[PDB]
Paper text:
RNF125 is a small protein (25 kD) that contains, in addition to the RING domain, three zinc fingers (ZnFs) and a ubiquitin interacting motif (UIM). RNF125 was first identified as a regulator of T cell activation, but has also been shown to negatively regulate the cytoplasmic viral RNA sensors RIG-I and MDA526, to interfere with HIV transcription and promote p53 degradation. Using mutational analysis, activity based assays, NMR and X-ray crystallography, we have demonstrated the essential role of a C2HC ZnF for the interaction of RNF125 with the E2, which originates from the requirement of the C2HC ZnF for the structural stability of the RING domain. Collectively, our experiments show that the RING and C2HC ZnF domains with their linker regions act as a functional unit held together by interdomain contacts.
Author numbering: 33 to 128
Write the structure that this text describes.
């Protein structure tokens, strides 16, 4: 599915595309590179940088809605991170 992150598996937040064509949350690939420099955490390809903002994916996420996995509220994908931040059922299940 075009809208999940290949490291955390949640709906993408600020999607970034790496030179190898993998798409991750900006913070997810930033933290991966902090620990294991110059490597894609999904396919292990050489990365000279975090990548570029996946503005095609960000655009499409504005016109997509999906149910939160934990409370079933229909949420816009662009706003899903903000939803799970304060979703009590999510917090119940995964912790703060
Ligand atoms: Cl709803
Ligand atoms: Zn992520
Ligand atoms: Zn990759
Ligand atoms: Zn929820």
């Amino acid at each position: 599915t075009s809208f999940d992150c290949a490291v955390c598996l949640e709906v993408l937040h600020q999607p970034v595309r790496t030179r190898c064509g993998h798409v991750f949350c900006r913070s997810c690939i930033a933290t991966s590179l902090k620990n294991n420099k110059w490597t894609c955490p999904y396919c292990r390809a050489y990365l000279p940088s975090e990548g570029v903002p996946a503005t095609d994916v960000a655009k499409r996420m504005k016109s997509e809605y999906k149910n939160c996995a934990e409370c079933d509220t229909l949420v816009c994908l662009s706003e899903m991170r903000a939803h799970i931040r304060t979703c009590q059922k999510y917090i119940d299940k995964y912790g703060p």
